[model samples]
Structure formats: structure tokens, C-alpha cells
Target: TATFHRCAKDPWRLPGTYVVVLKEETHLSQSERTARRLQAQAARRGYLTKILHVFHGLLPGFLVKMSGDLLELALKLPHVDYIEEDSSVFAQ
Candidate 1:
């Protein structure tokens, strides 16, 4: 059940980038290697993809930079639960 953040496409949402949240499960190992699986698989499919960060502890997923085509492919992955448009703010 891949889903998108409700406020997606807001002016502040980062372009062509997203946060991929994985489904929670018992015995799950949230680590860099685990996160890289998505990146590696996408590459093997000849679909351009990049993994920027891997969330841990209570965190549910990772950050990725890719186009819509890759986004389409990402939702089909078994572990993917949802995706959100990347966003940020700085300079206090």
C-alpha cells in the first residue's frame, strides 16, 4: 500500500526527491546495507536511482533521489510502505 504525503507538491517540497518509508516488521534490520538493497535493485533494472540516507531506530525508511519513473517502480517494492516529497528549510 504505497502512499504519498498528503501535502505533497507544496512549494517547499524538494524536486525529484523523496522519502521512502518501509513497512514495519518483526526482525527487521534497519541499516545501511538493508537500505542499499533498494538502490542496488533499481540499478540492476537500469532505472536511475540514488539513496541519500537510511533512517534508524524508530525511523521507518530512507531518502532517495529519482524521477517519477523510478518512483513508479519504487512503490512496487515489497518493503515500501509509502513515499513523501522531500522538503527542507534553513537559516534561522
Candidate 2:
């Protein structure tokens, strides 16, 4: 199963928030490559503030500013596992 899912139907996606995920890998090289692609994507769209690193996990990736319809684009990126909105998990 994929580590992430696109919330395209979710209307309340917070602007400037996104969780980009990469496929699981055991080598640092693979991780770096994945990071580079994601970073480039954000850079091209001018939403990248900085590349956030996420170490440890079956899914390795980063969080950055939302780049328009990235949810759709992410699915196409090589080694890109998935992308989803960053949402608040609030308690009632």
C-alpha cells in the first residue's frame, strides 16, 4: 500500500501545506534522489521555502509549500509514492 493518498475531494485543503512522500528505500542515494526531485518540483512552482527532511520510516520524504495541483503531479514523479494535504488532527 502507498504511504500517502491524495485528498483531492477534500475541499478544505489548507493553502501552502503539503506532505510529499517517497517510496521506501534502503539506500541514502535513493533517498537523496527522491528529495531532489521533490525539491525541484517545489522550486519550479515557487512554493519551496526549504526542503524538510524526514529520516526513518518505510516512507521517506519531505513537507513543503503546496505547488498548485501537486497532488496530481506527485503521482507521476518517479519514486514518488504519493502526496497529500497537511491537516490538523484536533480533539473535540
Candidate 3:
């Protein structure tokens, strides 16, 4: 499985909850199917999964809580394009 540069950050690289951004223009059903698959996968691995957000057409993605291997697994899901540890803002 391929990895992205953004995941290099300690926050993203670490095992924890994160906001996942899906590919642009993704369909609602496709997103739903992907969410179900992800949740099932997380459940099988004994990882707690939560639905923080489910944007449709606007951003087109969801937030999830996972860690270690589970987080890595989520990144490999089809259509998943980006991941951020959380949306905490900071001064620049």
C-alpha cells in the first residue's frame, strides 16, 4: 500500500483518531459503502470507530477514531485521499 507525505507528521503518523478526506466528486452511495466497510473493518480489528462528520458534495469525507494498525488500514481504504489527526486550530 502507498503512503503519503502528510502522514509523515508525528500526529498523523501516530495511532489515534483522525479526520479522513475522500477523493473529490465522490458519490454519496460510494461514500456510504466505504464508511460501512471501514466501520466493519475497524470493528473486526477491535478499534473504536466514530462518525465525527459525514460531508456530502461539500467536502466528501468522514471523521474516524482509530490507532496503530487500524489507522494504517483506514488510510488504505479506496478513495481515501487525505488524513489529519484532528481539526484543532493554532496560531501561526
Candidate 4:
């Protein structure tokens, strides 16, 4: 069975290949690359804000602005990949 795991922190670093995951309540597997990808996409979209707030509760005002920049940067990447909540593929 395929299991999905979501991470809350940035998993990538410069000069290295890594995957960033969205913070979620869902349990995940170590080898579940797709799940990590999906989570990263969500964080990029700002959909994961609620998830972030879920664990942290309310966020400081600065973090809100920071998150917006982060999401915008993530979504604005050149690759044109669309990841829906259903985890299906979409076109630009």
C-alpha cells in the first residue's frame, strides 16, 4: 500500500538535492517521495498554512508575512507543475 507522509520544515539545501514537505498531522513513510513532493507543493501554495497554524496555533504577524513570501517563491518556480488536493496532475 502507498502511504503518504508530510513534513513541516524545508528539507532542501543549496548545492544539494532535497525535498521540502508541508507540516501535517498525517503519518508518512520514509521512502514516500511523492508524498513529500505533494506536501512541498501544498506549502508552496499556502494551503498548508492552516496545517502550520494547527500545531503552532496562532502565528506572529511577521511569520505571516514570511510565509507569504515563502509560498509565493515556491509557487512561482519555473517548472509549471500543478498539484491539486486530490494529488492529480494538471496543466498550466
Shift of residue 69 alpha carbon in model 1, Å? 1.5
TM-score list, all predictions: 0.70, 0.59, 0.72, 0.21
Give the lDDT of residue 37 in candidate 2. Answer: 75
Clashes of 1: 0
Task: List the pairs of residues colliding in candidate 4.
Answer: 5-28
The segments of candidate 1 whose C-alpha lies over 4 angstroms from its true place after superposition are 6-9, 26-34, 90-92
Model 1 residue 79 distance off true place after TM-score fit, in angstroms: 2.4
What are the per-residue Cα lDDT tens digits for candidate 4 across 11-72? 42121112223234322332233333434765666655322111122311111112333443
- How well is each residue in 1-92 modelled by candidate 2, as lDDT tens digits? 34455446466456556676666663556666756776687578765545565545665766666555555555566766666667545468
**Winner by TM-score:** 3
Which structure among the candidates has the greatest lDDT? 1
**If both were scored by lDDT, which would come out higher, candidate 1 or candidate 4?**
1
> lDDT for every model?
0.71, 0.61, 0.70, 0.30
Off by over 4 Å in 4: 1-31, 49-92
Rank the models by lDDT, top first.
Answer: 1, 3, 2, 4
- Candidates ranked, most accurate by TM-score first: 3, 1, 2, 4
What is candidate 4's CA lDDT for residue 89? 29
Instruction: Show the colliding residue pairs in model 1.
Output: none
In TM-score terms, candidate 2 sits at: 0.59
lDDT of 1 by residue, 1-92 (tens): 58766344477667678887887861236545545776777788887777787777676788788776666666766677888877777699
* Model 3 lowest lDDT segment of ten: 1-10
